[PDB]
Amino acid sequence: GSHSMRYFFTSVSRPGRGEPRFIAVGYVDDTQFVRFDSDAASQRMEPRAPWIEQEGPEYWDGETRKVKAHSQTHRVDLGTLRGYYNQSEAGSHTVQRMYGCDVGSDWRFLRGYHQYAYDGKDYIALKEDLRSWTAADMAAQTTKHKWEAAHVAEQLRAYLEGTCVEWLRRYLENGKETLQRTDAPKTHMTHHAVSDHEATLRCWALSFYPAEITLTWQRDGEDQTQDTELVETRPAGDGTFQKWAAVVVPSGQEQRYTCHVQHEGLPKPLTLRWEP
Amino acid sequence: MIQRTPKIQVYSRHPAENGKSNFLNCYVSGFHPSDIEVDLLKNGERIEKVEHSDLSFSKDWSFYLLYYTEFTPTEKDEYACRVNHVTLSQPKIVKWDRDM
Amino acid sequence: YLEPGPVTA
């Protein structure tokens, strides 16, 4: 399996007074490992997985310093972008940043990324080659020129290709007991009778990690997308995930339908069928 | 300035059984901007003791949060999630439907 | 491990 380290930053300006609310979260795959919230009392990067508590107070110092640097960049950007967009001081605005690296099954660099949004829309993003930028509009074009003359992409490339992957691998090693474990989904099917002629079959997948999964229905061995409903994958709260997919079927024909489940933790896909 | 309404799921962490301690979740996603109020209800009354995940967002930039509280289900207690956001003209209330 | 320091927009 591939793996990824990703950080997510949100700043939300506070018109009446004070600096933006800032929240930062770090993930290794689907596992939150660190957080910073400008509203929390500690004012330090805090551990959210047990395996990151292995790191020493120098790590925590360095991560706190950096993360406050991020908060300050966003504070400035909220001001700059407000001006770029000719906006008043009355409105709250949001900046969101996400960056990180993916590695393949060999844990070698696969992909890096660094994207920025203003008020929920694309502002600027690093392109796939990590050598140039995609600016969505003319404000972002001004930012792109600044970052070009300041060779920002090159510094980011060094980090995304170098450091990011290096620490990802460290984390995968140190958190191996959970982070290198896949939890196959726990499945079952339920049945609910809508009327005298219509039944719903729901195929559940619980307790799986990572989040990536595919549930699909077939009827007599071919894919069936009509009359199906597939909920967004959702966190259980205990690090694992849940999902279900439902199909409506004519009462009595339950046996024709099969739910198929694919998941990193299942050596071959699994088929479920009602009986039960 | 696209505002996006929140999708809401209400469910338990574990398969729900009466008298067994569990967690009631309210998972709010796809919303923008980030300010949102989520209450978990027990027989129509706000549960006080509710925690939530650290704000994050998806690739489309829409936010998600998980609100959760420990509970022991019983046969007659009804649970629900109450959500308010700029995009909603009144609170949206989703009942916990265990038996799906 | 965070990147060293974002540059302002």
Residue numbers in the entry:
A (entry chain A): 1 to 276
B (entry chain B): 0 to 99
C (entry chain C): 1 to 9
Q: Which of the paper's sentences describe this entry?
A:
subsequently eluted from HLA-A*0201 molecules on melanoma cells. context of HLA-A*0201, present in 49% of Caucasian individuals. important tumor antigen, targeted by many clinical therapies.
unligated structures of A2-YLE, A2-YLE-3A, and A2-YLE-5A. addition, the P9 residue was an Ala in the native sequence.
